[PDB]
């Protein structure tokens, strides 16, 4: 503004910054219970038998979707078979 | 109409007021035992994603087993150091 002076060594601008600080997990679900730490291992709700498999290994699962499907038919077959061809 | 004689259209108010008489319709209860209720599928408790599974295709199920377990992430990565010694 006053007396004449140098102009200044830098004043090139950027918008790249870091991208650790970075947020963008937040909304698509709302509505939440309490919390929990992250691996857990699940059971299975009744006794049943593989017919057929909805899920491969490797595939991601989601609340809401189905996994897998069991056909309980009275007692369970046991008699003495167990391994043949 | 203000008569001794009238002739009844569809009620003539005698101790009506929840009207049962005869109706079948379809059954709602379970009937004492069980009726019908074999194979029936199964969905995911939690959003994750199959890092190792446990039981194969062909092999049954039974109740207080593991199926399969999960690893849900979602905090981010916050320096963590590593391990050497």
């Known amino acids: 503004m006053v007396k004449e002076v140098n102009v200044p060594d830098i004043v090139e601008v950027t918008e790249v910054m870091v991208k650790v600080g970075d947020k963008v ?21 009744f ?9 491969n290994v490797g595939d991601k699962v989601k609340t809401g979707s189905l996994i897998m499907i069991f056909e309980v038919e009275g007692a369970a077959p046991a008699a003495a078979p167990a391994k043949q061809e």
């Open 25 to 45: 997990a937040a909304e698509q679900s709302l509505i939440t219970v309490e919390g929990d730490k992250a691996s857990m291992e699940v059971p299975a709700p």
């Open 47 to 55: 006794a049943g038998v593989v017919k057929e498999l909805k899920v």
